[PDB]
Amino acid sequence: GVQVETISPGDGRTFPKRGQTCVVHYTGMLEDGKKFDSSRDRNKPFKFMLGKQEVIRGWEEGVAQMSVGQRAKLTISPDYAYGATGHPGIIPPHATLVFDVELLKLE
Numbered sequence: 001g002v003q004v005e006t007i008s009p010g011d012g013r014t015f016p017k018r019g020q021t022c023v024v025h026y027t028g029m030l031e032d033g034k035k036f037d038s039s040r041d042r043n044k045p046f047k048f049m050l051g052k053q054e055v056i057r058g059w060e061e062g063v064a065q066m067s068v069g070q071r072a073k074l075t076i077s078p079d080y081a082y083g084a085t086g087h088p089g090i091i092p093p094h095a096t097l098v099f100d101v102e103l104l105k106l107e
């Protein structure tokens with residue numbers, strides 16, 4: 001599944017709804033391993049639409065329980081991430097992923 005652990009609290013009131021654009025900064029890391037991606041390094045936030053199957057299941061259910069301004073550690077099991085096949089050349093089979101996610105704004 002997905003485990004959400006708060007780093008910094010949000011407003012505890014403004015949660016994304018299905019169909020909204022979430023604007024986030026993230027850092028992705030293989031559990032007890034190597035960092036693979038970060039939007040912070042690129043000085044440019046990532047945007048996606050909740051409920052439109054644009055991101056892995058762990059992100060869909062993880063970000064949905066976050067309020068605006070919240071920063072949280074998301075721990076995602078393989079079946080909620082890339083599963084048995086992984087992501088070719090980057091993510092191995094059966095990888096547990098950890099993400100540092102901050103919810104910047106909704107659009």
Ligand SMILES: CO[C@H]1C[C@@H]2CC[C@@H](C)[C@@](O)(O2)C(=O)C(=O)N2CCCC[C@H]2C(=O)O[C@H]([C@H](C)C[C@@H]2CC[C@@H](O)[C@H](OC)C2)CC(=O)[C@H](C)/C=C(\C)[C@@H](OC)[C@@H](OC)C(=O)[C@H](C)C[C@H](C)/C=C/C=C/C=C/1C
Pocket residue numbers: 026028036037046048053054055056059081082083087090091
């Ligand atoms: C160069 O950076 C790209 C993302 C990279 C790609 C490799 C990943 C290991 C890496 O590092 O992020 C991650 O950190 C990662 O795991 N992410 C990105 C952050 C959100 C969560 C997750 C994810 O779901 O990635 C995904 C991941 C690589 C998608 C996999 C695609 C193949 C499926 O079988 C997988 O099943 C488990 C999910 C990519 C995106 O977040 C991306 C916005 C969506 C894409 C490419 C597709 O949606 C599934 C696409 O399909 C036509 C769209 O609808 C898309 C919104 C259309 C526009 C034109 C494309 C935008 C492309 C954006 C791509 C990026 C920002």
